[PDB]
Ligand binder design. Structure first.
Ligand SMILES: CCC1=C(C)/C(=C/C2=NC(=C\c3[nH]c(/C=C4\NC(=O)[C@H](C)[C@H]4CC)c(C)c3CCC(=O)O)/C(CCC(=O)O)=C2C)NC1=O
Ligand SMILES: CCC1=C(C)/C(=C/C2=NC(=C\c3[nH]c(/C=C4\NC(=O)[C@H](C)[C@H]4CC)c(C)c3CCC(=O)O)/C(CCC(=O)O)=C2C)NC1=O
Ligand SMILES: CCC1=C(C)/C(=C/C2=NC(=C\c3[nH]c(/C=C4\NC(=O)[C@H](C)[C@H]4CC)c(C)c3CCC(=O)O)/C(CCC(=O)O)=C2C)NC1=O
Ligand SMILES: CCC1=C(C)/C(=C/C2=NC(=C\c3[nH]c(/C=C4\NC(=O)[C@H](C)[C@H]4CC)c(C)c3CCC(=O)O)/C(CCC(=O)O)=C2C)NC1=O
Ligand SMILES: CCC1=C(C)/C(=C/C2=NC(=C\c3[nH]c(/C=C4\NC(=O)[C@H](C)[C@H]4CC)c(C)c3CCC(=O)O)/C(CCC(=O)O)=C2C)NC1=O
Ligand SMILES: CCC1=C(C)/C(=C/C2=NC(=C\c3[nH]c(/C=C4\NC(=O)[C@H](C)[C@H]4CC)c(C)c3CCC(=O)O)/C(CCC(=O)O)=C2C)NC1=O
Ligand SMILES: CCC1=C(C)/C(=C/C2=NC(=C\c3[nH]c(/C=C4\NC(=O)[C@H](C)[C@H]4CC)c(C)c3CCC(=O)O)/C(CCC(=O)O)=C2C)NC1=O
Ligand SMILES: CCC1=C(C)/C(=C/C2=NC(=C\c3[nH]c(/C=C4\NC(=O)[C@H](C)[C@H]4CC)c(C)c3CCC(=O)O)/C(CCC(=O)O)=C2C)NC1=O
Ligand SMILES: CCC1=C(C)/C(=C/C2=NC(=C\c3[nH]c(/C=C4\NC(=O)[C@H](C)[C@H]4CC)c(C)c3CCC(=O)O)/C(CCC(=O)O)=C2C)NC1=O
Ligand SMILES: CCC1=C(C)/C(=C/C2=NC(=C\c3[nH]c(/C=C4\NC(=O)[C@H](C)[C@H]4CC)c(C)c3CCC(=O)O)/C(CCC(=O)O)=C2C)NC1=O
Lengths: 30, 162, 172, 160, 242, 172, 162, 162, 172, 162
């Protein structure tokens, strides 16, 4: 169904459509 | 004898502890509630006579056969001991109202109830029906928090008998 | 256990009666003064440690024999027992004060107490005195507290005193 | 990793892996659980480690944290420890990879140019890393402390 | 719109800030910020399959008991000795309750009469294996798991030499029962507190024996009465040619 | 044990903070609705026996296998155990309802319960159903009582339902 | 965690019993009392900053020697950990106010207090004096039943430390 | 399940002891008694059908009102569940006869009886009257020690219900 | 429970033999060094409180997360539990040191301990560290005491260390 | 009262057992050790006067503020009760030396210590510092196993107070 289109989570050599989920943000702590 | 006051004191004592804000807050509830309770008590007290005769009769009207010969609603002594018994219940209801807890009911009517009723061939159904009737009429003697209090204790007796 | 209402109820029941209009209003008055009562119990709870401590300092100021060897508040073990008993009695007096009845005090604390102390060799007259000192200071606190509404607490101060005096009498 | 390095050399010479290359993959993978434990311990104490590095640093160079110092002030010091947190993280990556590929692309190639722009004294960053070695190394067994220490000394080396 | 854009943090992602020419204020605290593993006290007890309830607080006959406190003691003794299993009012030991009402027996002797009752034999002795019976008697009377494989051999040997009633008396006359319940305290679960002279493995074993406030040492579970603390695991902690 | 306030406090403490003005007013609202809450708990207490009885009559009306030999509510001993469990669960649901938090229900009643029943051979789906019937009748009573002031109790009826639904889910 | 609500529920549960009029009266006390409690809580909450700095200083003013070198009121870390500790106390006081009982104080500060203070060479006298000072200033932030509540809990801590 | 055999074995086991002459004498009683018991059992077994219909009816004849509408002796389902219940009692009586003890009665009818009857509004009086009737008719189906056995167990049920 | 002699005896018995002249003299040497052993155990007993205190101060100096909310040595109750465990472990290490055998330590203290802590959420690595600090200070005291005769205690200092190291290893 | 002799006897009695070689070996330790113990005892006994005045003063020198007005090292009665208290400690140390165990210390000073000190606002720190000083001076009154004994018991008191 959308299974063919699904392995497109690998994107490119290095291309991920935006924002890498949760991202730690340590500046407050420092 | 279970009251809000005795309960909090019991709980303090058993932990070897002075009464603290938790326990005094509790006590304030019991004292704040006294007005409604005691209004219910006064109304149940002065209507006692008729509340009792009303409920006694209703036991016979709901269980017609009780009043036939050879039965337990027949003759002066059965019918006398019945009025007395409902009167005992109303009496302890007023006491529980005044006391701020079920203690008087627990100690003088609930503890032992079933054993006694079972040895003497007394059906709880009668007593529930006496109390259901008393509950119907107390609907128009009281209202608001005095009625809620009266209800609380009448219902408490009905659950004790089921 | 009894409180002032429960006591009324027991006496009524022994007559086979609903509470007398006499008894009803006596209890209506107890509800009337109950905020003051809560402050009075709170006065004791809020200063329990100092009440015991101050009673103690003064008891041994007067009776310097108790803290000598041979004395019943010597060595540390015995002093801790004596301090503990001061707390126990102050505790049951506060319970009686919340209840409006002495019974918890008489039944759970005072009953047998004198005979215990005599068996132990604990000088009952000294224990009675420690109770008299707790009374002085406790009432002090009942009468002069933190931002309580001004009024008359003498009825409650008396009643508290009789609980202290019951204990003293029972023990001496 | 050890894998990436071995393979890249293989492919570049158009050939299958050597006995040597195969052997090191085998020795490396055998140390997997141990290397993972070394990273865990250090990840688990990260906040303590940067701090003790940060104290060791400011004693040795109170000037960096002085009027004309790159790390002078509360928030110029906050960013400085954050950079120390960055490098400890990269050190845990390196230890589990068994080489520097990741450490290198992320935080040494370009680091001279970055810090020269910010006017950060590079050799005192190298000191901050030695300071972290000292702390981290005191939370690891002798054998694991050495294995970790190689990666700390690499970063110290690359800032040079 | 200046204010909205500016004068307002607005919504980006979340979150902000602390940076050039710079900064913001909500204060801070050094040992203020909560550590991340992060939480609670009481998560610990409650996490498992809560044994929130046991840390304990024994109930008793504070000389001068009320009928309500006495009924609470009687209900607590039945819940402890028979677990969460329903007991019909006809199955209750009315003679032993009457002796306790009259103050003629202490809470220890009331527990002795309940543990010697035929109802306890039918539920726990006749429906389980002798080793599982011993595990449950330690659970019900002492509030703990057994410490070592020696306690089992001594209790099995006493039961074989002196019968059922002498085995029940051996738990109740133990200096461990006397030291920690005395005469007036109802038995209660103890294995969640490190106790003096314990064996750390008692905590784990008492957890295995305590399936929670809805579990039934109930003798019906199809398989019926088995065992729950392993013999291999029981042997760690001691093993002797007792 | 937790109540709705205690829960707030635990979450605040895990931040290292005094309660948020957010949390404060959520709790001010609980105090606002507390008379209704007391009536709701009172509705259940005042009809506990009938709630259990009526649930019961209906459970066995539906599942006549339970009262045949081979069935889990046969003979008298098992029926009494089943009636007892109905009461126990209704009890802890009422406690949760006074508390404004499910924890007493989850910790003292629901924790381990499913595995108990499976060990026993007690059909959990039937127990879940008995809980669903108690819910119907209990809420019935919460909604239509003796001379309570007229208003909206739907928020509380929902919350009571979730306690019944927690128990059902946990057991089935 | 001890509150009026948890206490009555505990007492019901332990007798295998539904909540009855005794227990609901108690609960009403706790709910009726919430307004005064929560006013105290809000005032103690917003003044926290200064109540803490006031009490911290007062510990040094009453025990001057603490602030000399070699002593436990010297250097940033001692003085920091002190402010924090008084802040912990005020925090749990507000929690106890909001909760309707001493539970938060009992569970998070009282249980274990002496063992900790004894191992770390912390004198209760400081903490009593911090609290006595906080009690002085709270005299003019509140009045009536909110003040009585604030007092109840401050005094509870002082007795825990004696 | 209580029988003479299980009782003596229980008593041996609980003293960690082999069965001795005391216990084997006891067992001989149970075995010697089996003939009378089992004759009672066979007679009660084959007459079951009519013993049940006889007792069911007698409950309605002694409590006429039960069979009126709105009552618990009305409609197919009540009257069906009644026959069944008396049949349960006779069944366990035969089991107790065959088993050599009250075990089957104790475990399957007595344990829990009152709680069940009280929740379901079932009066013991009916059941006593069912059993009194069954006792009347069993007077002419048996005699001698089989009758004494039948009686022993019928009476045992009547005492369980009083 | 075993001591170093008892251990010898158990191994001999498993051979069915009287103790070997090998084993005899190993035990003669333990008697030879026993005064030193008594001083070593005495060093720990005489400074138990400081050993725990100093270990503690330093543990929380390093791991300031434990004393934040969310941390396993917060609030007072948990800190008291942690201080108590430090004492318990130091106690069984001293017992092992009097005995010349680790068994009392392994059997009464270490057995199950790790799994307890994991169940509790207690960070075992922090507990291991607290044990390492107790070791440093305890040995400090074993090596530098009040007017003990001068000699070499390194054998005993090692053995004490292995008991501290057993505990650490067992827990981490 | 805990001594080597009482301990072994207690352990025998509690197993219903005659004293055996294990218990008599133990006793020999206590008897062999008496010489060193009793030398410590005699030295502490005759120096008592000055050991007490030395330690009393050291409490004021280490806590200078104690000797200012309004404080607990001021006036004849405080300073008198202090000397007395240190004298009590030295007395029980000599008793423990002579007795062969901590019994006298456990029964007369340790049992109850904290409760008493807490009610009377007595800081353990003073007492530890009194004892630390006594320990310093006893370094030159004794040596060898008498010093070790003196130390054992002084340290035992210091741990009791921490
Ligand atoms: C303190 C509280 C208290 C209660 C509640 C109480 C109930 C009670 N009811 C009794 C008898 C009785 N109760 C009744 C009741 C009734 N008869 C009727 O006409 C009606 C059907 C019904 C009233 C609804 C009858 C007829 C007896 C006599 C039973 C007998 O002795 O045969 C008895 C036996 C002693 C006696 O004969 O008086 C007790 C103890 N006793 C108490 O001390
Ligand atoms: C948390 C439990 C709890 C407490 C403690 C409580 C106290 C309390 N004390 C009150 C009054 C008072 N309390 C006192 C007490 C005193 N007057 C004096 O001069 C004496 C020093 C002291 C003697 C005991 C007086 C005189 C009043 C005003 C009169 C009255 O309301 O009865 C009032 C009525 C409101 C007010 O006037 O402030 C409350 C609510 N309420 C509670 O729910
Ligand atoms: C913490 C509060 C608490 C709960 C909730 C509890 C549940 C519980 N239910 C049990 C049994 C039981 N529970 C039931 C219940 C049912 N049978 C059915 O067919 C129906 C589907 C259902 C009634 C709706 C029955 C029949 C048994 C007896 C099982 C047996 O012994 O065969 C038992 C075994 C012990 C005993 O029989 O007394 C426990 C522990 N115990 C507790 O202490
Ligand atoms: C329910 C009735 C019941 C049984 C059956 C029972 C078995 C049982 N046998 C045990 C031990 C034992 N059982 C044996 C038996 C044997 N050793 C051999 O080499 C032979 C092959 C065999 C004899 C034929 C031995 C030697 C031990 C002691 C094991 C030890 O402690 O090392 C133990 C451990 C507790 C104790 O030592 O008292 C139990 C529970 N316990 C019971 O309560
Ligand atoms: C003894 C313990 C105790 C109880 C039980 C208690 C009840 C109580 N319920 C109240 C109100 C009320 N109670 C309800 C309840 C309901 N309304 C409905 O229509 C539904 C059928 C039911 C849903 C639960 C409503 C709507 C009010 C009026 C609004 C309010 O005061 O919140 C009030 C305020 C006075 C009044 O308006 O009557 C009290 C004191 N107080 C107590 O101290
Ligand atoms: C949740 C409730 C809670 C409380 C109340 C608490 C008290 C507490 N205070 C501590 C330390 C401390 N407390 C103080 C207190 C003070 N220093 C001063 O300048 C003043 C004299 C005084 C304030 C009045 C000091 C100086 C320390 C450091 C002690 C040390 O580690 O040496 C510690 C040891 C752990 C640590 O170093 O933080 C605890 C547990 N901890 C808790 O979790
Ligand atoms: C194994 C032994 C055993 C017994 C003894 C037993 C009794 C028993 N009788 C019941 C109901 C009943 N019992 C009767 C009895 C009668 N109705 C009449 O016409 C007469 C007055 C009377 C017969 C004398 C009735 C009408 C019900 C239905 C009650 C209801 O659900 O409303 C129920 C409820 C479950 C059900 O509805 O079947 C039980 C458990 N159950 C058992 O498992
Ligand atoms: C056999 C001898 C013995 C040992 C060794 C023992 C350990 C032990 N430690 C416990 C708890 C504990 N142990 C600690 C210890 C620590 N917290 C930290 O953050 C530090 C890393 C560490 C101190 C160095 C804490 C905080 C708890 C309480 C956990 C909780 O309830 O949340 C408990 C649970 C029971 C209780 O809290 O009393 C046991 C059984 N119990 C025993 O009987
Ligand atoms: C009350 C129980 C008890 C104790 C404690 C005891 C101690 C004790 N330690 C001794 C020796 C000693 N003790 C040590 C100990 C040490 N040397 C060092 O330099 C280290 C700092 C320390 C390491 C532990 C040494 C080196 C000797 C002398 C050699 C020897 O006798 O073995 C001696 C022999 C006499 C002497 O030379 O003083 C005794 C009696 N005897 C006892 O009955
Ligand atoms: C048998 C063993 C035993 C001990 C150890 C003991 C201690 C002890 N010290 C006390 C008082 C005291 N202790 C001191 C101590 C001191 N004052 C100073 O100048 C110094 C700071 C310090 C000496 C280091 C003071 C001032 C008091 C009077 C406290 C009071 O009543 O206010 C008291 C209260 C009774 C009394 O006033 O005498 C006890 C029981 N009692 C005993 O029976």
């Amino acid at each position: 169904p959308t299974a063919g289109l699904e392995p497109f989570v690998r994107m490119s050599r290095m291309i991920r459509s935006g924002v890498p989920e949760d991202r730690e943000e340590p500046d407050e702590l420092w | 004898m279970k009251t809000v006051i005795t309960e909090v004191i019991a709980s303090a004592d058993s932990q070897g502890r002075f009464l603290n804000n938790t326990e005094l807050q509790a006590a304030n509830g019991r004292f704040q509630r006294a007005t409604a309770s005691m209004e219910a008590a006064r109304a149940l007290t002065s209507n006692a006579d008729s509340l009792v005769k009303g409920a006694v009769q209703e036991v016979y009207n709901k269980f017609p056969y009780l009043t036939q010969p050879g039965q337990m609603g027949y003759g002066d002594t059965n019918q006398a001991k019945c009025a007395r018994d409902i009167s005992h219940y109303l009496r302890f209801i007023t006491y529980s109202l005044v006391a701020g807890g079920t203690g008087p009911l627990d100690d003088y009517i609930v503890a032992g109830l079933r054993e006694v009723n079972r040895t003497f061939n007394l059906s709880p159904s009668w007593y529930i029906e006496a109390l259901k009737h008393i509950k119907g009429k107390v609907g128009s003697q009281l209202s608001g928090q005095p009625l809620t209090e009266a209800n609380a204790y009448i219902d408490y007796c009905i659950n004790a008998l089921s | 256990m009894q409180d002032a209402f429960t006591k009324a109820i027991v006496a009524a029941d022994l007559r086979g009666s609903f509470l007398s209009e006499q008894e009803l209003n006596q209890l209506t008055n107890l509800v009337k003064e109950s905020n003051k009562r809560l402050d009075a119990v709170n006065a004791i709870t809020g200063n329990a440690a100092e009440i015991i401590s101050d009673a103690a300092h003064k008891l041994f100021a007067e009776q310097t024999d108790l803290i000598r060897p041979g004395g019943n508040a010597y060595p540390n073990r015995r002093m801790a027992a004596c301090l503990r008993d001061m707390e126990i009695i102050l505790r049951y007096v506060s319970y009686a004060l919340l209840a409006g009845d002495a019974s918890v005090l008489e039944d759970r604390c005072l009953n047998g107490l004198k005979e215990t102390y005599v068996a132990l060799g604990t000088p009952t007259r000294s224990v009675a005195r420690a109770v008299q000192l707790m009374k002085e200071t406790a009432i002090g606190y009942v009468n002069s507290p933190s931002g309580v509404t001004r009024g008359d607490c003498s009825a409650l101060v008396n009643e508290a005193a009789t609980y202290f005096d019951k204990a003293a009498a029972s023990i001496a | 990793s050890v894998l990436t390095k071995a393979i890249v050399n293989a492919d570049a010479e158009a050939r299958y892996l050597s006995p040597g290359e195969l052997d090191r993959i085998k020795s490396f993978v055998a140390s997997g659980e141990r290397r993972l434990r070394i990273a865990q311990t250090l990840t688990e104490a990260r906040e303590r480690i940067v701090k003790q590095a940060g104290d060791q640093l400011f004693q040795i160079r109170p000037d960096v944290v002085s009027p004309g110092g790159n790390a002078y002030g509360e928030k110029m010091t906050a960013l400085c420890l954050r950079d120390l947190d960055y490098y400890l993280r990269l050190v845990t990556y390196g230890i589990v990879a068994g080489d520097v590929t990741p450490i290198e692309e992320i935080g040494i190639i370009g680091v001279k140019e970055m810090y020269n722009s910010l006017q950060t004294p590079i050799p005192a960053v190298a000191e901050g890393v030695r300071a972290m070695k000292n702390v981290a190394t005191s939370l690891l067994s002798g054998d694991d402390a050495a294995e970790a220490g190689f990666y700390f000394d690499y970063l110290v080396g690359a800032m040079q | 719109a200046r204010e909205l854009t500016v004068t307002p943090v607005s919504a980006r992602r979340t979150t902000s800030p602390t940076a050039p020419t710079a900064p913001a204020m909500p204060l801070a605290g050094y040992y203020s910020r909560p550590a991340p593993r992060a939480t609670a006290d009481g998560d610990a007890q409650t996490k498992l399959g809560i044994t929130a309830v046991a840390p304990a607080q024994a109930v008793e006959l504070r000389p001068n008991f009320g009928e309500t406190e006495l009924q609470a003691v009687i209900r607590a003794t039945y819940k402890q000795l028979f677990g969460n299993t329903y007991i019909l009012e006809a199955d209750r030991v009315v003679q032993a309750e009457s002796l306790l009402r009259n103050g003629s027996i202490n809470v220890r002797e009331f527990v002795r009469l309940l543990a010697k009752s035929e109802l306890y034999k039918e539920r726990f002795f006749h429906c389980t294996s002798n080793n599982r019976f011993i595990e449950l008697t330690f659970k019900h009377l002492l509030g703990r798991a057994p410490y070592n494989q020696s306690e089992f051999v001594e209790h099995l040997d006493r039961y074989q030499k002196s019968g059922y009633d002498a085995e029940i008396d051996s738990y109740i006359d133990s200096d461990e029962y006397r030291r920690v319940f005395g005469e007036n305290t109802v038995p209660y679960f103890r294995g969640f507190k490190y106790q003096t002279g314990q064996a750390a493995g008692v905590f784990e074993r008492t957890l295995k024996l305590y399936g929670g406030d809805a579990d039934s040492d109930t003798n019906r579970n199809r398989q019926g009465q088995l065992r729950q603390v392993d013999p291999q695991e029981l042997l760690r902690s001691g093993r002797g040619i007792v």
